[PDB]
């Protein structure tokens, strides 16, 4: 609908009442939100990122403890 709403918004007097997309009824605002929404490949590709984010966040936080000392050591060099 990204290329469909653009045509609709090019003429200010052609209302978009609603409709059903894949057995799901939407309003005009739902269509607008659906338009700004990414595709299946992008959304599913980011789905695995969020599910594995919990493990990734745990590893980053555990590895952050040695990095805290390095940042403080680098900060001291920045001071002097």
């Amino acid at each position: 609908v990204k290329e469909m709403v653009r045509i609709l918004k090019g003429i200010p007097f052609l209302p978009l009442l609603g409709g059903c997309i894949d057995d799901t009824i939407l309003s005009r605002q739902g269509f607008i939100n659906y338009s700004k929404l990414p595709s299946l490949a992008l959304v599913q590709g980011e789905l695995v990122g969020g599910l594995t984010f919990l493990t990734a966040q745990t590893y980053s936080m555990l590895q952050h403890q040695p990095r805290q000392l390095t940042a403080l050591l680098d900060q001291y060099v920045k001071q002097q």
Partner: peptide
């Protein structure tokens, strides 16, 4: 949770890096 924090807190920095590598090796 709380017991894990205490158990991890008793390990040296070398073992902390060893367990971090194992978690990265296992789960990644």
């Amino acid at each position: 949770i709380q017991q894990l924090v205490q158990d991890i807190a008793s390990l040296t920095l070398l073992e902390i890096s060893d367990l971090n590598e194992l978690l990265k090796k296992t789960l990644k």
